[PDB]
Tab-separated table of C-alpha atoms in Angstrom:
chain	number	residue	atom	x	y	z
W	1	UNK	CA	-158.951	80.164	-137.975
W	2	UNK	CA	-160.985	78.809	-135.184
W	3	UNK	CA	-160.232	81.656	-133.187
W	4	UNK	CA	-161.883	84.154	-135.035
W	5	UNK	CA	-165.412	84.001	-133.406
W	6	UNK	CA	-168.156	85.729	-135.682
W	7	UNK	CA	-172.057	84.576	-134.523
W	8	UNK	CA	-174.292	86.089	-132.693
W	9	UNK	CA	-177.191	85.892	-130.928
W	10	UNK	CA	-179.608	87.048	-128.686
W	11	UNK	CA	-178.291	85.361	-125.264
W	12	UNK	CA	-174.925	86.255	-126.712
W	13	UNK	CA	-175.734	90.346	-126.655
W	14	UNK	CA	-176.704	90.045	-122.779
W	15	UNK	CA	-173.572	87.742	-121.849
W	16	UNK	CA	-171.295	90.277	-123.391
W	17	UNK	CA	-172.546	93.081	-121.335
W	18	UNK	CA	-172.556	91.397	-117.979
W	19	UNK	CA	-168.898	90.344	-118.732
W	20	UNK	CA	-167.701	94.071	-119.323
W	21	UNK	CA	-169.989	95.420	-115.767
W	22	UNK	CA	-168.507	92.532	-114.149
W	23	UNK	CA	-171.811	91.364	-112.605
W	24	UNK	CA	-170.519	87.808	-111.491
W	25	UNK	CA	-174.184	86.706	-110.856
W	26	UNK	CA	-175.652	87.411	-114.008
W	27	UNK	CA	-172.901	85.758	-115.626
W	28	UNK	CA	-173.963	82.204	-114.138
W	29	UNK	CA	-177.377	83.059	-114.859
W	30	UNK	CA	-176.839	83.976	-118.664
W	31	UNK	CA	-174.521	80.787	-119.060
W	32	UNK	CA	-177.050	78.599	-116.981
W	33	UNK	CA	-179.874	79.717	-119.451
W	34	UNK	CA	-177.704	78.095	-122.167
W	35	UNK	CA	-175.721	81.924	-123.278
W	36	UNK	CA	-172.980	80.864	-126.453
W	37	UNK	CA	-169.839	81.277	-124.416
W	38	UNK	CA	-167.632	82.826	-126.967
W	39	UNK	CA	-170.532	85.353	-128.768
W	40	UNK	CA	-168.762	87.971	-130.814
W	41	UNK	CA	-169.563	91.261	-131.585
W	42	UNK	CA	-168.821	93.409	-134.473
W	43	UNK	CA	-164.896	93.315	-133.570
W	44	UNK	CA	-164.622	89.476	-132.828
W	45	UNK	CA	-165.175	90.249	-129.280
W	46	UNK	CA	-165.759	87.698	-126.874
W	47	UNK	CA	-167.292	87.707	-123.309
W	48	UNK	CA	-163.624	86.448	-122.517
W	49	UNK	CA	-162.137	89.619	-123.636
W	50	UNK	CA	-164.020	91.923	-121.593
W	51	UNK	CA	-163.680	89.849	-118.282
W	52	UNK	CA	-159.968	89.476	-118.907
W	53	UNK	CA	-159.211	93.294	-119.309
W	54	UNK	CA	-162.011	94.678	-116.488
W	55	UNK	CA	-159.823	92.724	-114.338
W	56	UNK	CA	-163.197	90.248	-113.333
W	57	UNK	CA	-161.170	87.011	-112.351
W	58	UNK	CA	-163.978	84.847	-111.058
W	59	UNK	CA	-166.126	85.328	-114.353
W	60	UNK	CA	-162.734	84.891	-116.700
W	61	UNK	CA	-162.841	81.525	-113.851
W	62	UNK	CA	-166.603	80.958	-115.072
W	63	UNK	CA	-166.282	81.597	-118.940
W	64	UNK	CA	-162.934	78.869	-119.204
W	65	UNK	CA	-165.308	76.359	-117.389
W	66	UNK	CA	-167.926	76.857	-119.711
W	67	UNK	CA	-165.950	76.165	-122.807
W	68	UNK	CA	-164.797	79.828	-123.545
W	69	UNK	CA	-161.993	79.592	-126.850
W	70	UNK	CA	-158.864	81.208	-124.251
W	71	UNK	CA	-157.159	82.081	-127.912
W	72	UNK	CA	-160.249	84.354	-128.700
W	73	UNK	CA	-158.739	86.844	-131.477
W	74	UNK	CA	-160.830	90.493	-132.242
W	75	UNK	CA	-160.711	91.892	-135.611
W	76	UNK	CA	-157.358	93.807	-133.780
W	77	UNK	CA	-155.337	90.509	-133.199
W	78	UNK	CA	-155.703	90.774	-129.876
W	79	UNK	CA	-156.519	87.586	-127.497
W	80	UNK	CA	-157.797	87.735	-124.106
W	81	UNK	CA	-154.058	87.368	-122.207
W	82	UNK	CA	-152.990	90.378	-124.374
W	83	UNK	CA	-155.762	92.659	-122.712
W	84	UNK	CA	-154.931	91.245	-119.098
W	85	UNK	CA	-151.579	92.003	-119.942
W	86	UNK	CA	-151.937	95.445	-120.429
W	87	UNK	CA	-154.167	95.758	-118.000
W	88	UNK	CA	-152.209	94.523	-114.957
W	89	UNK	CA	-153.782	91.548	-113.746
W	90	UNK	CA	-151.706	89.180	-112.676
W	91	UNK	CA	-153.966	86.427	-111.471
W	92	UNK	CA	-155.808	86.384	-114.610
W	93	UNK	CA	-152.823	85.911	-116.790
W	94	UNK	CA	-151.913	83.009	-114.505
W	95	UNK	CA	-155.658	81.378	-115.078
W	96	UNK	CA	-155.704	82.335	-119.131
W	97	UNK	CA	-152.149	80.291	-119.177
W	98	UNK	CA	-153.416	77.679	-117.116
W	99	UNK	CA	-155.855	77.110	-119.393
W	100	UNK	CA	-153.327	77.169	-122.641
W	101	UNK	CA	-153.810	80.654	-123.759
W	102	UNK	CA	-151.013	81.208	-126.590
W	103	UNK	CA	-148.073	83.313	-124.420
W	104	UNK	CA	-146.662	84.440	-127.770
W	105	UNK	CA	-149.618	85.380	-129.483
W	106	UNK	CA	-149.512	88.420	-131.836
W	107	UNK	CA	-152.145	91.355	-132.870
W	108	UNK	CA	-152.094	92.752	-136.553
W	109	UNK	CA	-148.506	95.017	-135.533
W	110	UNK	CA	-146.805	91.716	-133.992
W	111	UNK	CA	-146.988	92.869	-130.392
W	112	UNK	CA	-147.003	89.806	-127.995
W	113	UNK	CA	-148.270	89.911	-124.467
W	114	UNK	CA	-144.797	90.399	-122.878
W	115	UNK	CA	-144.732	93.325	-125.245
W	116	UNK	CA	-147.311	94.930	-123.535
W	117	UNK	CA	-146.288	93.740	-120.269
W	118	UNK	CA	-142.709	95.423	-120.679
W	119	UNK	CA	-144.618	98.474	-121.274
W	120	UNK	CA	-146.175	98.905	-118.303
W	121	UNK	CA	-143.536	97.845	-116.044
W	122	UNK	CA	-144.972	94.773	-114.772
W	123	UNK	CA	-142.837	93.128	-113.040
W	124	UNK	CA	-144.544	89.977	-112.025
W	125	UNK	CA	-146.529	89.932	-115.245
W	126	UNK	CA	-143.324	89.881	-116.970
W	127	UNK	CA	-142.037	86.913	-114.820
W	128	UNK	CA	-144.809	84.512	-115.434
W	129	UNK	CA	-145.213	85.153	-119.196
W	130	UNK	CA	-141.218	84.382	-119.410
W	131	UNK	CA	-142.143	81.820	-116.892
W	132	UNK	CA	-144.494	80.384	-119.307
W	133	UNK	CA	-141.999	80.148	-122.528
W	134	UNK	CA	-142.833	83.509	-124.293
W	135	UNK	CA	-140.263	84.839	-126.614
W	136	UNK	CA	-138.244	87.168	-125.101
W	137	UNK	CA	-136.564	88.421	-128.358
W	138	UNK	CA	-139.937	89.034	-130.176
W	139	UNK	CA	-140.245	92.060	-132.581
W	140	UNK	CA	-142.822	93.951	-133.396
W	141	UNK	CA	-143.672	95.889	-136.789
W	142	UNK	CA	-141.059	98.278	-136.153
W	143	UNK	CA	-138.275	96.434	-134.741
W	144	UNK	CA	-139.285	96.819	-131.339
W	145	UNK	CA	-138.782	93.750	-128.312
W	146	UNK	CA	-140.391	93.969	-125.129
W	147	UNK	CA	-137.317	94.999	-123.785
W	148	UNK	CA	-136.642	97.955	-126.135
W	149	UNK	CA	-140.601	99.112	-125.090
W	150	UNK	CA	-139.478	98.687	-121.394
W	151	UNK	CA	-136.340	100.641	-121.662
W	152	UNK	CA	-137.880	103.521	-123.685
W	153	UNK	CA	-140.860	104.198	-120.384
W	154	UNK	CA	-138.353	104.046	-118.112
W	155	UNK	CA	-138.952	100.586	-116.769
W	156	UNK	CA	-134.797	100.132	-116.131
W	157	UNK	CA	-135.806	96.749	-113.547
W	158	UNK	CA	-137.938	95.237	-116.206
W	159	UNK	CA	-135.312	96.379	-118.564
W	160	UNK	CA	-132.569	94.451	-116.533
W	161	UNK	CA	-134.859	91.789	-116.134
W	162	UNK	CA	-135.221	90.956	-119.908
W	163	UNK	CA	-131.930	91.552	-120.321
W	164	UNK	CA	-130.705	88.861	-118.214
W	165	UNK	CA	-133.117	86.680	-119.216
W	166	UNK	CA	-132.490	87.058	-122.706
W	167	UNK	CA	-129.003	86.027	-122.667
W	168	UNK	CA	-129.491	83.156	-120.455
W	169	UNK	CA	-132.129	81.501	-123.101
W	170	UNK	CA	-128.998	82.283	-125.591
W	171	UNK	CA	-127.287	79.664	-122.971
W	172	UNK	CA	-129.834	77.468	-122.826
W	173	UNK	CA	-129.552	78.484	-118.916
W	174	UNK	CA	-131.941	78.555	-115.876
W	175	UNK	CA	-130.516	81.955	-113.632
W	176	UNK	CA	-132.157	83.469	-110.318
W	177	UNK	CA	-130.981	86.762	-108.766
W	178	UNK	CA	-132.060	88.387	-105.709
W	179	UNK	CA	-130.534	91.946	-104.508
W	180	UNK	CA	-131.136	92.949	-101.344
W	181	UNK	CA	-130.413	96.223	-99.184
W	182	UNK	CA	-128.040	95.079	-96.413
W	183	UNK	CA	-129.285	97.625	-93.498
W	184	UNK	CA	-132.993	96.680	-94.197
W	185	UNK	CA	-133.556	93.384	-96.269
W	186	UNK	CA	-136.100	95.242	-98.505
W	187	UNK	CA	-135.579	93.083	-101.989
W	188	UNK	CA	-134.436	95.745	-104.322
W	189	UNK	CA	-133.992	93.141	-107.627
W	190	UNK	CA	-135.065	89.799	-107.872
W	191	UNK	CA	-135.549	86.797	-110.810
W	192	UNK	CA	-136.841	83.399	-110.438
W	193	UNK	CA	-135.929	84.583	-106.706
W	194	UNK	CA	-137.675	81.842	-105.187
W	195	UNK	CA	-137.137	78.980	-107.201
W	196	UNK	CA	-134.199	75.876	-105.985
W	197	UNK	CA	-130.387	76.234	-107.492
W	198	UNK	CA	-127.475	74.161	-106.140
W	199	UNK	CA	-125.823	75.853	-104.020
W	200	UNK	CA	-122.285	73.938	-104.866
W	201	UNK	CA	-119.777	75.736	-102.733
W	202	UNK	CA	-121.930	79.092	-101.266
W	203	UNK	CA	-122.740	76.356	-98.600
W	204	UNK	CA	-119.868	77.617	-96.808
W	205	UNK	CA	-120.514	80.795	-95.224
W	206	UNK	CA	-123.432	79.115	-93.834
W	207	UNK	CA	-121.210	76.262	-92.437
W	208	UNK	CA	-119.044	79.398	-91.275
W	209	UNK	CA	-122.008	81.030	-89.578
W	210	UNK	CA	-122.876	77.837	-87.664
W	211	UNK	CA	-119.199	77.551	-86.500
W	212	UNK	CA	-119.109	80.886	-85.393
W	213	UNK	CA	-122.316	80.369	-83.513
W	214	UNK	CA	-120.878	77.978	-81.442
W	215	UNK	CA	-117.778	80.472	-81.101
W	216	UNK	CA	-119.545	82.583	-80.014
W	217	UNK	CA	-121.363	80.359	-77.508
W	218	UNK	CA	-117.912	78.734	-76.226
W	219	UNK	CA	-119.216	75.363	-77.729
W	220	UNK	CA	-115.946	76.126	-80.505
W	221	UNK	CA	-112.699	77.742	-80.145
W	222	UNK	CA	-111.051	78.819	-82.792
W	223	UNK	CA	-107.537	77.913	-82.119
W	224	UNK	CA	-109.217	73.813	-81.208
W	225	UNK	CA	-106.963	71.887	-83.557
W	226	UNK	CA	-108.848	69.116	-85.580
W	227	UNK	CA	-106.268	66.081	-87.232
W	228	UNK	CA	-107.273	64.307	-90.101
W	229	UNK	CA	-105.620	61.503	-91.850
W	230	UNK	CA	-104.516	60.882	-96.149
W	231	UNK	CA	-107.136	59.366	-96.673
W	232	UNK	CA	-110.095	61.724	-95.127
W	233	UNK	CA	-108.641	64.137	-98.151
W	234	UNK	CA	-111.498	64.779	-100.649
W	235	UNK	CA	-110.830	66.257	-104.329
W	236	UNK	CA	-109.792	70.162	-104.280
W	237	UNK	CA	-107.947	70.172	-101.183
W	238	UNK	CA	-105.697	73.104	-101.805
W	239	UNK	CA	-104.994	74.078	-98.003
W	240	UNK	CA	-105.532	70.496	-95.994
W	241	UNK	CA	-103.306	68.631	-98.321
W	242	UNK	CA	-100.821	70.447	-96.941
W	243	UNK	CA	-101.579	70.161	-93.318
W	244	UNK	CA	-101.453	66.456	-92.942
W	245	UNK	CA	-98.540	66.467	-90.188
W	246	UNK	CA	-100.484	68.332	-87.514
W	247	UNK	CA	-103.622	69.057	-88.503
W	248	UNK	CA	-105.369	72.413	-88.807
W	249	UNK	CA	-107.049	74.644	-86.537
W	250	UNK	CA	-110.978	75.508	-86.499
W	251	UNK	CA	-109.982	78.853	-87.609
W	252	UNK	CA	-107.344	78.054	-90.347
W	253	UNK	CA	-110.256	75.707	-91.433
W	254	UNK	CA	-113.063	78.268	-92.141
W	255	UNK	CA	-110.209	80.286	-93.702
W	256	UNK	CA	-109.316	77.283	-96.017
W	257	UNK	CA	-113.060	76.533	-96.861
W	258	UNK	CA	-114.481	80.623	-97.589
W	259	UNK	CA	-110.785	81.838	-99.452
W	260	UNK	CA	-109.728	78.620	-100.962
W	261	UNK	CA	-113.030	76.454	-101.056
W	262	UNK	CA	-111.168	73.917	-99.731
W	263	UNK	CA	-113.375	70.538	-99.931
W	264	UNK	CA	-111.617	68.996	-96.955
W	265	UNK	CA	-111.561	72.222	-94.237
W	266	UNK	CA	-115.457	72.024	-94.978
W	267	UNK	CA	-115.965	67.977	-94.247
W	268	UNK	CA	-114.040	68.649	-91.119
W	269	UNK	CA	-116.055	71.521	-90.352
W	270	UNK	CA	-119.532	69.762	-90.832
W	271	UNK	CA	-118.664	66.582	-88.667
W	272	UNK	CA	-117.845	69.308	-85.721
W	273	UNK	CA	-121.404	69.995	-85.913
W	274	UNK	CA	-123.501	66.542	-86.766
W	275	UNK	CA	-122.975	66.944	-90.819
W	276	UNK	CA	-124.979	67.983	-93.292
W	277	UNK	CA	-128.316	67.398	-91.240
W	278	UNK	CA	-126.620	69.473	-88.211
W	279	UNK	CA	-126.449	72.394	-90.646
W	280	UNK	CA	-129.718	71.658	-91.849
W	281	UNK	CA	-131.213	71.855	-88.143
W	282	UNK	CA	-129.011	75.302	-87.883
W	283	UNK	CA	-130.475	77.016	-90.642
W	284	UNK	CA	-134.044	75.699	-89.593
W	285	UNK	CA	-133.319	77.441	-86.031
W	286	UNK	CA	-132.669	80.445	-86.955
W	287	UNK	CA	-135.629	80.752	-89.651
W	288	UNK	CA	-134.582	79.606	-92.761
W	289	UNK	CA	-136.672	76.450	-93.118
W	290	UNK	CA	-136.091	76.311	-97.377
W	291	UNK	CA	-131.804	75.979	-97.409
W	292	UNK	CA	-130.983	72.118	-96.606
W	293	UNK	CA	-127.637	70.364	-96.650
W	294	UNK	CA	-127.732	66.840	-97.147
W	295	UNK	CA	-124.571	65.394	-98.570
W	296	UNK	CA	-120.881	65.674	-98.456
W	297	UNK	CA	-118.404	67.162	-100.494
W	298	UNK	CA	-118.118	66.727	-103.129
W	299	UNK	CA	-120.789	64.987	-103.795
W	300	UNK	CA	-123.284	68.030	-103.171
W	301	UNK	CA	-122.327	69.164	-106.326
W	302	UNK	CA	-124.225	67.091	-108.440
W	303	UNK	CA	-126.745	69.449	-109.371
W	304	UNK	CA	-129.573	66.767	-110.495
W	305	UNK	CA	-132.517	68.976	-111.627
W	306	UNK	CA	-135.862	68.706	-109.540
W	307	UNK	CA	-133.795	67.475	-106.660
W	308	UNK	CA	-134.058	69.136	-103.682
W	309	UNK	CA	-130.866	68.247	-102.275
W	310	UNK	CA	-128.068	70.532	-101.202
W	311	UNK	CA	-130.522	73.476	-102.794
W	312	UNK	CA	-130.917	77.104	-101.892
W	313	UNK	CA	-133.099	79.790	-103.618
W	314	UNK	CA	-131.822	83.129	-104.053
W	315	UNK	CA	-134.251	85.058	-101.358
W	316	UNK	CA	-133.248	82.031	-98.764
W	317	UNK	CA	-129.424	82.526	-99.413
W	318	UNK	CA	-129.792	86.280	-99.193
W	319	UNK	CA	-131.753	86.700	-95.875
W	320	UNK	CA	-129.935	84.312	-94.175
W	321	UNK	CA	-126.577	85.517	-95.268
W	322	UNK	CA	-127.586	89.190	-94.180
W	323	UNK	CA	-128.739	87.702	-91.355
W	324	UNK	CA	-124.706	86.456	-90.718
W	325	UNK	CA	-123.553	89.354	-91.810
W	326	UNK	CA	-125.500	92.153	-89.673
W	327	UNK	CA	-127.867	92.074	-86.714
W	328	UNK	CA	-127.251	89.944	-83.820
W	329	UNK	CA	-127.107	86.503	-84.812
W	330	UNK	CA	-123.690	86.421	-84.581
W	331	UNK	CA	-121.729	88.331	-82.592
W	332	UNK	CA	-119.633	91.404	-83.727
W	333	UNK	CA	-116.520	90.058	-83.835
W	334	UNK	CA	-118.534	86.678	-85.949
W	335	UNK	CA	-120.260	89.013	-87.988
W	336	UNK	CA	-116.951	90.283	-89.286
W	337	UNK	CA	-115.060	87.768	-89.233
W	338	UNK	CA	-117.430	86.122	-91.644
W	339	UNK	CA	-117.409	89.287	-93.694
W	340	UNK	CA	-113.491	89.753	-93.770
W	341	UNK	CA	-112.820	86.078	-95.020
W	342	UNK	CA	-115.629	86.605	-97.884
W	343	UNK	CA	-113.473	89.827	-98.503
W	344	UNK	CA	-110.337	87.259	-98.868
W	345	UNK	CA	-111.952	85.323	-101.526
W	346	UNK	CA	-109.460	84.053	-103.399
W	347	UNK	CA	-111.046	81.909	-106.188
W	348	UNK	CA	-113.614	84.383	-107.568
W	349	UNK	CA	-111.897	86.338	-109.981
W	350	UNK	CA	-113.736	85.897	-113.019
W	351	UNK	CA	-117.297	86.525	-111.525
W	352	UNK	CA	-118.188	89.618	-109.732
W	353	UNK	CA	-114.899	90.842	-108.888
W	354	UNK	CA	-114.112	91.071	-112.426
W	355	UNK	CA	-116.840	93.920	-113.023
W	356	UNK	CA	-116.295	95.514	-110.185
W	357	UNK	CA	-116.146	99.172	-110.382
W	358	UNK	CA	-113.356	100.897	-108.532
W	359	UNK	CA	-113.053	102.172	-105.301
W	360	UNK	CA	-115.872	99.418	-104.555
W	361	UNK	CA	-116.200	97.010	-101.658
W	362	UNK	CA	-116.509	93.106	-102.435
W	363	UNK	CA	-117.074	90.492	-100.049
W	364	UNK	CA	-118.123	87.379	-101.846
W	365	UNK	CA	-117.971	83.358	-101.856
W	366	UNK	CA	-118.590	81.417	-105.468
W	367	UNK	CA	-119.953	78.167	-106.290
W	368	UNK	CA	-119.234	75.538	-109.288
W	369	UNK	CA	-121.063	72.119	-110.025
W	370	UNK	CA	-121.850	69.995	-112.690
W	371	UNK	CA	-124.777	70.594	-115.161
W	372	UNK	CA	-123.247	73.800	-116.155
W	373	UNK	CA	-123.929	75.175	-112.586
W	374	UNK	CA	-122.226	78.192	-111.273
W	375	UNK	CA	-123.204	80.741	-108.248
W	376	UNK	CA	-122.072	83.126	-106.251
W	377	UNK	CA	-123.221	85.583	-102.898
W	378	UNK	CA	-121.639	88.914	-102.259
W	379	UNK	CA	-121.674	91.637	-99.714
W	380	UNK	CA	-120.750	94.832	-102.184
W	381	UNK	CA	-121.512	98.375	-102.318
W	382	UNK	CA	-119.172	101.960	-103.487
W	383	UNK	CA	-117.499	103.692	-100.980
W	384	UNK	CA	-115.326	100.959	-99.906
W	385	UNK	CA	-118.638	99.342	-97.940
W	386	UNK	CA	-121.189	96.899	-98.700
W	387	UNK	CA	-124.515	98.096	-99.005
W	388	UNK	CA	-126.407	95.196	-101.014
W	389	UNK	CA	-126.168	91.467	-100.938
W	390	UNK	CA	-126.585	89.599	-104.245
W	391	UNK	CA	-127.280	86.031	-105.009
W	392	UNK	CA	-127.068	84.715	-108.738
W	393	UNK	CA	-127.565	80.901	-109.661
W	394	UNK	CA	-127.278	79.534	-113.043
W	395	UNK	CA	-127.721	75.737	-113.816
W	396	UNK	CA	-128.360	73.194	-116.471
W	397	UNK	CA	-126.378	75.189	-119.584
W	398	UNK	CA	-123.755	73.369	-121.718
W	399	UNK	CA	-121.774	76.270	-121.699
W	400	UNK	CA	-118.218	76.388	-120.902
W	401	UNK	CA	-116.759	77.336	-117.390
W	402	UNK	CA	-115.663	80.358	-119.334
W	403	UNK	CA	-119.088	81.422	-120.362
W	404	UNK	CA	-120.401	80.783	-117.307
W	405	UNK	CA	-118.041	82.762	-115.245
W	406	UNK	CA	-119.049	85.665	-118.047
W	407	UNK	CA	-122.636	85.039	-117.463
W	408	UNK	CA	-122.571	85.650	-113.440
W	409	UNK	CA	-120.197	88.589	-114.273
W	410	UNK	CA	-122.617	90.164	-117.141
W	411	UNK	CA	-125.310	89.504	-114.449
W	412	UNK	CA	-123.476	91.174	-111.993
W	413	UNK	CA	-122.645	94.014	-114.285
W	414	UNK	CA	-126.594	94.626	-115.033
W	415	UNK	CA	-127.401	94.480	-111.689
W	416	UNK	CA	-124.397	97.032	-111.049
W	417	UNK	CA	-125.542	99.698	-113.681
W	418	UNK	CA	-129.257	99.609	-112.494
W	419	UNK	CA	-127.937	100.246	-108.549
């Protein structure tokens, strides 16, 4: 009951008013002449409060320094991170929860910050309260959750947003997305979009770019046959099992390793260009200085959290895989080439492809690792063309393959009924 402030004083009177006016210099003053940082007025009002919602980050700054209760409750039930919040501003949440302000704190009607957050459409609000562990299934007094509030103002990317995060907390999952427009890169969608994943097997339309860079550059040839022995055969070798006689070429490879995921095809593949730090130093020329490579298959599906190893995030993956896929990277011939063996995925089913509506265009590569980690990145659009690439991640579950393959898919479903 702490947090019900209710004394007040003469310094206390002034302090309050320079907090609302947001007069940053009188502030210090007040609280230099010894002001009670958390004076109250008739509503349990504190000089917290007013700084938080007139959007005054640099007193809010001041007032936590000082001492200032960051769980402040008025006679409303309202705390300071409910007020900045509602009002939009972002930084200020971020200090208020910095400083241990309650993320799931309730007024007198049960609304929570992300309640109000949802309202409003506030996207990034919305992320960092999640972000920060608040409930995403909390109800109000009438039933309401901060997603039914965003759905009923229109706020359909919020509303996606919650949705997907809801049902990966049911998981016990960690899931990024990112959707981007294909002909311009603006991000349409995006979750968690720049936080690490494994990227398990979606390595390989990178390693396929970087092959047909050197195509293109007459450093490769396709039709260059590469022999490999029994015992060079990693696990899930579907296609170079079979090729043990004479060997493979660099095309049937990159076939092999985008339709099949063939383990093998992609070994071969990397030691043609220096291994996993050779495609490391390929993404880092051509701008993408977050994706790394550095093991083998299959070891780079190990998926250990906090390591950095064989990671992506989803904005990396997405703007370097448009940046395969159109523009002049590669050439065209590359660019579709790429594009036509993502469209001969053969080992997707159950993810995107299995939501996809018809008549729809699908070009897509999927990724599977331990720790419950699944991905996948797609080229897709109506009309029989792409028009948006997506990137989903999901890691560290101890749900089946089964319900992970339906997560990616519901994902992918959301994502598809908000185009």
């Amino acid at each position: 009951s702490h947090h019900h402030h209710h004394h007040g004083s003469d310094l206390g009177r002034k302090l309050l008013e320079a907090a609302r006016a947001g007069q940053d210099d009188e502030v210090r003053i007040l609280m230099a002449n010894g002001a009670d940082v958390n004076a109250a007025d008739n509503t349990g009002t504190t000089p917290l409060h007013l700084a938080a919602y007139s959007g005054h980050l640099e007193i809010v700054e001041v007032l936590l320094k000082h001492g200032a209760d960051v769980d402040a409750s008025d006679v409303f039930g309202y705390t300071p991170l409910h007020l900045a919040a509602y009002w939009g501003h972002l930084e200020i949440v971020e200090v208020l929860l910095k400083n241990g302000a309650d993320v799931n704190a309730m007024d007198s009607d049960g609304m929570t910050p992300l309640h109000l957050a949802a309202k409003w459409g506030y996207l990034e609000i919305v992320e960092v309260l999640l972000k920060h562990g608040a409930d995403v299934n909390a109800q109000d007094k009438f039933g309401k959750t901060p997603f039914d509030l965003a759905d009923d103002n229109g706020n359909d990317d919020v509303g996606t947003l919650l949705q997907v995060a809801a049902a990966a907390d049911q998981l016990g999952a960690r899931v990024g997305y990112i959707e981007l427009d294909l002909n311009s890169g603006k991000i349409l969608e995006s979750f968690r979009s720049e936080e690490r994943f494994p990227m398990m097997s979606t390595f390989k339309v990178l390693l396929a770019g970087a092959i047909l860079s050197r195509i293109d550059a007459g450093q490769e040839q396709l039709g260059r046959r590469i022999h490999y022995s029994q015992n060079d055969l990693v696990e899930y070798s579907p296609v170079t099992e079979k090729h043990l006689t004479d060997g493979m070429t660099v095309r049937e490879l990159a076939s092999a390793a985008i339709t099949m995921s063939d383990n093998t095809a992609a070994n071969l593949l990397l030691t043609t260009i220096g291994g996993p730090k050779g495609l490391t130093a390929f993404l880092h020329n051509m701008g993408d200085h977050v994706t790394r490579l550095d093991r083998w298959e299959p070891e780079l599906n190990e998926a250990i959290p906090n390591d950095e190893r064989d990671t992506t995030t989803p904005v990396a993956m997405a703007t370097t895989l448009r940046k395969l896929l159109t523009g002049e990277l590669l050439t065209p011939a590359s660019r579709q080439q790429l594009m036509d063996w993502m469209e001969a995925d053969k080992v997707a089913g159950p993810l995107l492809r299995s939501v996809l509506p018809a008549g729809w265009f699908i070009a897509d590569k999927s990724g599977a690792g331990e720790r419950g980690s699944r991905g996948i990145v797609a080229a897709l659009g109506p009309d029989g063309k792409p028009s948006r690439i997506v990137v989903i991640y999901t890691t560290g579950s101890q749900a089946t393959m089964d319900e992970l393959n339906r997560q990616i898919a519901e994902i992918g479903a959301s994502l598809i009924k908000n185009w």
